[PDB]
Amino acid sequence: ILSTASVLAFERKLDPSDALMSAGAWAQRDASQEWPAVTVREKSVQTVDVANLPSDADTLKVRFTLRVLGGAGTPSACNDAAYRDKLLQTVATYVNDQGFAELARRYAHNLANARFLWRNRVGAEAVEVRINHIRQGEVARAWRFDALAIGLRDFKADAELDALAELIASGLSGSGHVLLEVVAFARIGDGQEVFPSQELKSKTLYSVRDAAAIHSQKIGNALRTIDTWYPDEDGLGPIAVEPYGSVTSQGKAYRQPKQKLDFYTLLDNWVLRDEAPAVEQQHYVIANLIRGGVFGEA
Amino acid sequence: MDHYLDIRLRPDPEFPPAQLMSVLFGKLHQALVAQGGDRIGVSFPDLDESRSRLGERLRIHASADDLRALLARPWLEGLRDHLQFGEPAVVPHPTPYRQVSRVQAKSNPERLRRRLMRRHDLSEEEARKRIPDTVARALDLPFVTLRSQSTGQHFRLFIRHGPLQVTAEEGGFTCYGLSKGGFVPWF
Numbered sequence: 001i002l003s004t005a006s007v008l009a010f011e012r013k014l015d016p017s018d019a020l021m022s023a024g025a026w027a028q029r030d031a032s033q034e035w036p037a038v039t040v041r042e043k044s045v046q047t048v049d050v051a052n053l054p055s056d057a058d059t060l061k062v063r064f065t066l067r068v069l070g071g072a073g074t075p076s077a078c079n080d081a082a083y084r085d086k087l088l089q090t091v092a093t094y095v096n097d098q099g100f101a102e103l104a105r106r107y108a109h110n111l112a113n114a115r116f117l118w119r120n121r122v123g124a125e126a127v128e129v130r131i132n133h134i135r136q137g138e139v140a141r142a143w144r145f146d147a148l149a150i151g152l153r154d155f156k157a158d159a160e161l162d163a164l165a166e167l168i169a170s171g172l173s174g175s176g177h178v179l180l181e182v183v184a185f186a187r188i189g190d191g192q193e194v195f196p197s198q199e200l201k202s203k204t205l206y207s208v209r210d211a212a213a214i215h216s217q218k219i220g221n222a223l224r225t226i227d228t229w230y231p232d233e234d235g236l237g238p239i240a241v242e243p244y245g246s247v248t249s250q251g252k253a254y255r256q257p258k259q260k261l262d263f264y265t266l267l268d269n270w271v272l273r274d275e276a277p278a279v280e281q282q283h284y285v286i287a288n289l290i291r292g293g294v295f296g297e298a
Numbered sequence: 299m300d301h302y303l304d305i306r307l308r309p310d311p312e313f314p315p316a317q318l319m320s321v322l323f324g325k326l327h328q329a330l331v332a333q334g335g336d337r338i339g340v341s342f343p344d345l346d347e348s349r350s351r352l353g354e355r356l357r358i359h360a361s362a363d364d365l366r367a368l369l370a371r372p373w374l375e376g377l378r379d380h381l382q383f384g385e386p387a388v389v390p391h392p393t394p395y396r397q398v399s400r401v402q403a404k405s406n407p408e409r410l411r412r413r414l415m416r417r418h419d420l421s422e423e424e425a426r427k428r429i430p431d432t433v434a435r436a437l438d439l440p441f442v443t444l445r446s447q448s449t450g451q452h453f454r455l456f457i458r459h460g461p462l463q464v465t466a467e468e469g470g471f472t473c474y475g476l477s478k479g480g481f482v483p484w485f
């Protein structure tokens with residue numbers, strides 16, 4: 001009968017790091033290893049945490065590292081070994097039929113346009129994202145993008161973006177170790193307010209060691225904002241790959257289970273009864289498997 | 299002022315429309331102080347007076363050449379994936395006119411107390427006897443949340459749409475695109 005397993009805990013592929021934000025001046029981004037860190041300072045209005053650049057600095061250097069792991073369909077916990085073998089066979093026919101070439105191109109786009117710069121991008125004058133492949137320590141291959149010419153809405157082809165997509169593809173297929181250092185320089189203005197992530201004296205800001213930082217899961221949600229295959233009305237662009245694919249800002253849950261387009265019903269149709277969906281929805285399913293999570297009933 | 303350009307906010311998974319509207323308002327302010335003059339005004343065609351919302355449209359009223367100047371300037375750089383632009387087109391007619399003015403209120407009694415102490419050399423107790431806490435007025439108006447660049451303070455810029463009027467008068471506009479006498483067509 002091959003029912004769905006009771007536990008399915010997929011590990012997270014595409015591990016990002018906490019995005020340390022340090023400040024400095026534009027036109028010296030090439031010497032940006034001794035830049036001062038953006039410190040969270042108190043302000044009494046109640047007291048709130050604000051985080052600004054220094055008054056001689058217009059460029060926010062947000063830097064994180066990304067580990068692209070591979071082994072996208074193999075769970076870390078699964079009860080039914082027959083279901084595990086059917087799921088690995090399903091993911092293997094996906095990969096051999098069409099490799100990680102749309103997913104990795106979209107992840108390379110979310111690295112290219114600085115969507116991990118969440119609110120530090122909306123009024124930024126010029127964003128430049130430098131992605132360095134770090135193999136055996138130093139640099140294996142260096143990328144440099146204009147994150148504003150590469151849009152947030154459209155996934156357009158480029159020459160360097162295909163090489164970055166092939167790197168993330170080889171990392172997701174298990175064919176290599178991919179570790180990427182992603183450095184983005186946001187021209188915001190002299191002493192303009194930057195927005196690190198927000199902890200929980202009405203407001204606290206996240207800071208690792210006397211330096212502001214965006215959370216790693218926020219960077220991961222920005223990297224996963226690839227889902228354009230959902231039922232799209234109103235002109236909403238890519239949303240983040242979630243089961244019951246939801247936006248909390250808009251309060252709407254696309255890919256509802258009333259339609260047959262959530263990750264769970266698509267997975268239970270693709271694995272159990274072999275009803276293979278369209279190539280777009282199975283891209284979405286494998287993107288959920290790269291996201292990780294706790295799948296299965298209780 | 300017979301030309302207009304609708305800047306409609308795209309829906310965004312990451313941002314509410316009020317946040318993008320305040321960012322667009324600040325960018326338009328920077329474009330207007332870079333521009334000069336007093337002949338460029340704004341309006342909010344999706345205004346909802348019941349919930350005091352500004353909607354998802356911002357209509358920039360100007361001449362044709364001023365809009366052709368502003369559509370190429372770098373104030374829209376970095377915003378073009380949260381906006382959609384029309385063309386500078388002529389206005390319809392007949393359209394009633396209304397006033398888009400900023401409304402400020404004495405919403406902090408302690409700032410008035412500090413001004414009274416600076417202007418009459420009084421103490422804090424004379425100030426609290428003179429300016430009680432029942433002077434705090436809260437406006438039920440739509441607003442954009444702006445951060446200044448000369449000072450470093452974050453303020454709410456309350457925009458009130460005036461009563462509808464058949465025929466406009468001559469008048470200028472502030473560099474926030476609001477009215478210091480000018481009127482805009484409404485449609």
